[PDB]
Amino acid sequence: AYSFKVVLLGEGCVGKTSLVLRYCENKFNDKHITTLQASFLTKKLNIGGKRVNLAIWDTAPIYYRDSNGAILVYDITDEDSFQKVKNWVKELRKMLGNEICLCIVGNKIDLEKERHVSIQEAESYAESVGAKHYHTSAKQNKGIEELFLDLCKRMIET
């Protein structure tokens, strides 16, 4: 059975912790500060027969060490959060081998009426650095099951 390590990256306030809490426990709160009550949480999967042990890491070399995939999140309502995405890529590449499966993720899509990131622009940067781009809303639970499933499959292929 497959054992994968996945790290969450990006600026504060974008929804990194909400994403892990939503995926792993189906909880979401916008009333107080959320903090992961562990270094990582475990999720088990079955993909076309085979089992997958997933360890999802969050933070408020030990962190980067032994990672197979990476989830780099920005906030669709906030252009600075996106423009800082490139700093994290040019830190992920310093820490780890360019063999790691990277996701770039536009979170908070329930707030579309307040969008400030260009979809074209975001998807273009993703392709140029070899990664895939995804849209999520932790609040409404949209796009998240698909993000983790596709990442798991990508890590299985290489």
Ligand SMILES: Nc1nc2c(ncn2[C@@H]2O[C@H](COP(=O)(O)OP(=O)(O)O)[C@@H](O)[C@H]2O)c(=O)[nH]1
């Ligand atoms: N409307 C909306 N709010 C969100 C979403 N995801 C997170 N939030 C809220 O944005 C705030 C920051 O979230 P947090 O998970 O702590 O971001 P982090 O610093 O990257 O870990 C919290 O109030 C969340 O409840 C979303 O998809 N939609």
Ligand SMILES: [Mg+2]
């Ligand atoms: Mg957090």
